């Protein structure tokens, strides 16, 4: 349980380095305000640029092989069985 | 229980990293901007939200299928060998089968 | 400088915030006290604001949600909000700006039109909700409603993003 | 029934008031309009109510309805001699649209125990109420607006009688504080070359445990020179003309006292034309612009029904 | 009585009753709200005795759904939306379905279950009127296939909107079974449209509901999934008999996109139960036997209890050798507990 803890410390450490690399690329983009005369055009044209931006990203991501071996899924399964027992009392 | 904290902060960090990467891909990738009508723009909005809903239910059903296969093999290796948690796990399965038998009789009488 | 952006710094570890923007100080304080009654799995940090642009503070976290509590019995809450949405970014309007029009239960003493805040939300692409914060039973329904928006904008659920909240809160009249 | 369906969808949508309105014309009194009747209608205190359209109303059955009303309101005072008698008087020539039904007058005039003293005055009318006429049948008579003069206990015992005979129900009328600013801008859009009163405004502060009132007076020759600098497109009163006229009145108050009155609530507008209040109290002080105000009150009275 | 001024005067009274004597127009009295709760109990028994909603009551919900928050007699307000009569789909969605979806994804899950209990009673009374509207109209000499075809896309976009409400709110709560019982109770109303209502339209749900119910941890969700898919076979093959008669006139025809989609549902569910090939097109050392009838975790409670009732002096646990003769004894124990929908599915499909 301790070695699968420190694997999840290290996998959350390397994606913390991924987001601060994305934070340093995002700070170069400056200020962009919005007026009243062209507010319907400056929010819907960029939504076409916004919905295209994760269309490549949700298709790049595979079903992720999360490395878990033993003694986490058993303890999460008993917590799942404890909430399944309360849900079948409430639906009764 | 620290493993729920590790999985919840891992899913939160994955969601924040995915929305940061989509914000960087929105700031760095552009479209050709022309003079267009509004209804073709909202038609592209509804077609893109149908396509992004299709790939999000594809990723959700494949990730949930991998999770249920790992939980099925984890419960198979759990109930292969008799352990010390069986004395409450057998009582929990007996209470779940009695509550499910009551839900079967209630569903049959309610349907008739 | 005196600008606002939702993405400059780090949020933290299971910690979100909310920027309560309004003119009334006794009405938004009871909304701020009622959000701490409904418990959750995240640390809540309620920020109270008068009018945008804010003063240059350096101890501010990453902002996940800015609500604009306008009053339907006051034009002073509307004219400060019109000066508030000039100094904003277009990345706030991807599902991170909610509106609250208080005074909707009293249709005898109202001081601005209902179609005005619809037209303010239609050209700026923001969801519009109506609630009366003078009733303590209505305020706990409102304080439940600010938490489940803040679970989306902080990214505490898998699969639902901030622009997924904008697609669910759309408003369009029937073309027939 | 299909035009009853199309009037719901304008009320179900958020749009119900046009942003560009017409300046009201000079309503000249015709020869069919009685001059001695309209002087009695002026300088009186009125309470407004809205009403659903009536059933089996005829113009020749008023003699039977006068005897049933005189036998009932004496009896309601006995359950809790009276020399009172109601008069159903019909007025002519007030209508501008020919499809409107005829308005009439209901008084209570005391008899001569020695003209009697009028204790209560009821008035049913429909001035430019054409949007509700095609939503009713031809059996229905559409008189939405009602004005009462007198005590509220005499209103409830006669308003009981319209519930049990004509299958209707009275509701209290209320005008919003947003809609007082449009009718104040309409009263400053008038044309005058005669004796005028003072434009009186009154705001109330909602953020107090007690009441706080501000009396505010504007000279109307100073109001007319303030209006035409704002009013630049003639013939139409727009959305931006009224909201910039209220903003320069608020900025005139702001440089002296540093109190924002745009957070407050406007409750009383009294000009040279008429005086208004939010709960339905009106005092019409002009006869040349009589039906222009009363068509605007039927413009609100259909909206509280629908 | 279908007289016109007896219904317009009832419209003119009760619209003024709900407007003046409402909740938020008062000074927050609990005693007048109890009488307003007692007045709404008279309305919900009068709309059910008449079997059509009043024209005052749907006009009040046009003006109150922007003004409602989600509490303060929720159960009397969600039954007031349950008996609204049928209209067009484009008129309901700016006035009801936009203001419902602003409160559906944001309130609690007891509100999320009470919307789908209200919409399954809305799917009762709308399909009850459309089942007998064909019978009581011999007047129009024109064919009614444009009017039934105009009523076809009004109700198929109804179920695909609530099916879009069901597969999005599953992602919000992240697979709770308490919402999943009342999604499949809403499709119990869908799957009885040709047998009980005689309406020639077969609509299907997107498969985010399907693999969340197939891979659920509950036996009763798997019984109701095998109940609806048994009803989907008897609705579609009887519509194949409707396609075979109406081929010579080319009037009542179905598209070929619902036959290839239904083949994707039937092949993928027998690969997770019977064929032992769980990887298909939607889903892409015992990975071929991780998902079976006896290897599913909801039926694993019956798999442990089968080996205890055979011999309660056990030493090893062997759940993978249940084949042949004691596999029929394992199906005899599952059929006796009340799995009647799985018994009718295995004898037909």
From Swiss-Prot, chain A:
It comes from the Eukaryota. Component of the CENPA-CAD (nucleosome distal) complex, a complex recruited to centromeres which is involved in assembly of kinetochore proteins, mitotic progression and chromosome segregation. May be involved in incorporation of newly synthesized CENPA into centromeres via its interaction with the CENPA-NAC complex. Acts in coordination with KNL1 to recruit the NDC80 complex to the outer kinetochore. Component of the CENPA-CAD complex, composed of CENPI, CENPK, CENPL, CENPO, CENPP, CENPQ, CENPR and CENPS. The CENPA-CAD complex interacts with the CENPA-NAC complex, at least composed of CENPA, CENPC, CENPH, CENPM, CENPN, CENPT and CENPU. Interacts directly with CENPH. Residues 6-26 form a coiled coil. Detected in several fetal organs with highest levels in fetal liver. In adults, it is weakly expressed in lung and placenta. The record marks 80-81 as: Breakpoint for translocation to form KMT2A/MLL1-CENPK oncogene. The lineage of its organism: Eukaryota, Metazoa, Chordata, Craniata, Vertebrata. It is linked to Chromosomal aberrations involving CENPK are a cause of acute leukemias. Translocation t(5;11)(q12;q23) with KMT2A/MLL1. The gene is CENPK. This is Centromere protein K.
Swiss-Prot record, chain B:
Keywords: Acetylation, Centromere, Chromosome, Coiled coil, Isopeptide bond, Kinetochore, Nucleus, Phosphoprotein, Ubl conjugation. It comes from the Eukaryota. It is found in: Nucleus; Chromosome, Centromere, Kinetochore. The modification Phosphothreonine is found at residue 31. Belongs to the CENP-H/MCM16 family. One of its GO terms (cellular component) is chromosome. GO terms for molecular function: kinetochore binding. Its main location: nucleus. GO terms for biological process: chromosome segregation; kinetochore assembly; kinetochore organization; mitotic spindle organization. This is Centromere protein H. Self-associates. Component of the CENPA-NAC complex, at least composed of CENPA, CENPC, CENPH, CENPM, CENPN, CENPT and CENPU. The CENPA-NAC complex interacts with the CENPA-CAD complex, composed of CENPI, CENPK, CENPL, CENPO, CENPP, CENPQ, CENPR and CENPS. Interacts directly with CENPK. Interacts with KIF2C and NDC80. Interacts with TRIM36. Component of the CENPA-NAC (nucleosome-associated) complex, a complex that plays a central role in assembly of kinetochore proteins, mitotic progression and chromosome segregation. The CENPA-NAC complex recruits the CENPA-CAD (nucleosome distal) complex and may be involved in incorporation of newly synthesized CENPA into centromeres. Required for chromosome congression and efficiently align the chromosomes on a metaphase plate. The chain holds residues 38 to 149 of 247 of the full protein. Signal peptide: none annotated. There is a cross-link at residue 30 (Glycyl lysine isopeptide (Lys-Gly) (interchain with G-Cter in SUMO2)). Residues 10-112 form a coiled coil. The gene is CENPH.
Swiss-Prot record, chain C:
Keywords: Centromere, Chromosome, Cytoplasm, Kinetochore, Nucleus. Component of the CENPA-NAC complex, at least composed of CENPA, CENPC, CENPH, CENPM, CENPN, CENPT and CENPU. The CENPA-NAC complex interacts with the CENPA-CAD complex, composed of CENPI, CENPK, CENPL, CENPO, CENPP, CENPQ, CENPR and CENPS. Its main location: nucleus. Disulfide bonds: none annotated. Isoform 3 is highly expressed in spleen, and intermediately in heart, prostate and ovary. Isoform 3 is highly expressed in resting CD19 B-cells and B-lineage chronic lymphocytic leukemia (B-CLL) cells and weakly expressed in activated B-cells. Isoform 1 is selectively expressed in activated CD19 cells and weakly in resting CD19 B-cells. InterPro entries: Centromere_Cenp-M, P-loop_NTPase. This is Centromere protein M. One of its GO terms (cellular component) is nucleus. It comes from Homo sapiens. It is found in: Nucleus; Cytoplasm; Chromosome, Centromere, Kinetochore. Component of the CENPA-NAC (nucleosome-associated) complex, a complex that plays a central role in assembly of kinetochore proteins, mitotic progression and chromosome segregation. The CENPA-NAC complex recruits the CENPA-CAD (nucleosome distal) complex and may be involved in incorporation of newly synthesized CENPA into centromeres. Pfam families: CENP-M. The keyword Cytoplasm applies. GO terms for biological process: chromosome segregation. The keyword Electron transport does not apply.
Swiss-Prot record, chain E:
It is found in: Nucleus; Chromosome, Centromere. It comes from the Eukaryota. Sumoylated. Sumoylated form can be polyubiquitinated by RNF4, leading to its degradation. Desumoylation by SENP6 prevents its degradation. Induction: By follicle-stimulating hormone (FSH). Belongs to the CENP-I/CTF3 family. Component of the CENPA-CAD (nucleosome distal) complex, a complex recruited to centromeres which is involved in assembly of kinetochore proteins, mitotic progression and chromosome segregation. May be involved in incorporation of newly synthesized CENPA into centromeres via its interaction with the CENPA-NAC complex. Required for the localization of CENPF, MAD1L1 and MAD2 (MAD2L1 or MAD2L2) to kinetochores. Involved in the response of gonadal tissues to follicle-stimulating hormone. Component of the CENPA-CAD complex, composed of CENPI, CENPK, CENPL, CENPO, CENPP, CENPQ, CENPR and CENPS. The CENPA-CAD complex interacts with the CENPA-NAC complex, at least composed of CENPA, CENPC, CENPH, CENPM, CENPN, CENPT and CENPU. Interacts with SENP6. This is Centromere protein I. The gene is CENPI.
